[PDB]
Amino acid sequence: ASVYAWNRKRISNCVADYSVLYNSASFSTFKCYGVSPTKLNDLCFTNVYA
Amino acid sequence: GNYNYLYRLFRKSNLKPFERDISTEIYQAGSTPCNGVEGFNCYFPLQSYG
Amino acid sequence: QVQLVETGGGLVQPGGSLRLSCAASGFTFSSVYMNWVRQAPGKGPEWVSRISPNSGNIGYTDSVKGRFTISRDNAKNTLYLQMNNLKPEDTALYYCAIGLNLSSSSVRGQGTQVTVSS
């Protein structure tokens, strides 16, 4: 969607492997704030909003 | 701004008590070896106060 | 203690491309690359130009296209910035920062402020 019409999705009740995303080299923008970009596999949250 | 004061932000393990870590090797944050060359998953370990 | 000693830049009148130097010490310089970034009075800092260690590709804002050039020398372990057709708008602090891909709020030196005097 457009920048003003940014699309929102909810993710829950699954397992997220952020290692594949982080180690991809196909993305030029990787900025994690609040938690380290790595060691994300050790954190479990109630919901994720994309 | 006075940015002459630096500090260590990336390290593989926590320092032991009264340790002086002066190594400036580029920190590796991914599977790909860094080999002392900056790039993806290769971050300089120093950061300034300012 | 890494010291990014930056050479001062005197006042230069328009008519000749300005040459500025910026040195680094206290760490292995051939590993990481260096970056030129400018802060002008009345506005926040902005990234100017970057040079890769191995590929040696100069990347800088298109707004400064065709007038800014970089030259790095590991033997002397320093950077040199050349600006052609210098205009008064160039008046600012062209400081240096150890270049990381983001190059945002990273390590930097005091630098020297240069203003083009008509």
Entry keywords:
part of a larger assembly; 3 chains; A: 50 residues; little secondary structure; two-stranded antiparallel sheet; 2 strands; C: mainly beta; 38% strand; globular; Spike protein S1 (chain A); viral protein; spike protein; Spike glycoprotein; Nanobody Ty1
Short description:
This is part of a larger assembly, with 2 copies of chain A (50 residues) and 1 copy of chain C (118 residues). Chain A is largely without helices or strands and 50 residues long.
How would you describe this protein?
This is part of a larger assembly, with 2 copies of chain A (50 residues) and 1 copy of chain C (118 residues). With 50 residues, chain A is largely without helices or strands. In chain A, 10% of the residues lie in helices and 8% in strands. Chain A contains 1 helix and 2 strands, in the order βαβ. In chain A, strands 1-2 form a two-stranded antiparallel ribbon. The two termini of chain A are 13 Å apart. In chain C, a hairpin with a 4-residue loop joins β5 and β6. Helix content of chain C is 0%, strand content 38%.
